[PDB]
Amino acid sequence: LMAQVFFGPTYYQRLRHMVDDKIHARARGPVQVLTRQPVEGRSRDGGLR
């Protein structure tokens, strides 16, 4: 490489936010009883606002 590279060990930490705990998709599913709109929440297979 034409440019030299800064290089060495550094202390890194893994945070709790992982993509597989955030990915969510919905085509159709449960709806609220009062308004008949998609429910809220990824855990409940909800929709996006």
Partner DNA sequence: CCCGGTGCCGAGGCCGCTCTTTTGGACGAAGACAGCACAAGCACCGCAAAAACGCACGAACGCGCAGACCCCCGCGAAAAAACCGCCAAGG
**Residues near DNA, by CB under 7 A:** 21-22, 24, 40-43, 46, 48-49
Q: Is 19 helix (H, G, I), strand (E, B) or coil?
A: helix
Q: How many CB atoms lie within 10 A of CB 16?
A: 5
Q: How many CB atoms lie within 10 A of CB 39?
A: 15
**CB of 8 vs DNA, minimal distance in Å:** 36
**CB of 20 vs DNA, minimal distance in Å:** 11
Closest CB to DNA among residues 6, 28: 28
Q: What is the DSSP letter of 35?
A: T
**CB of 46 vs DNA, minimal distance in Å:** 6
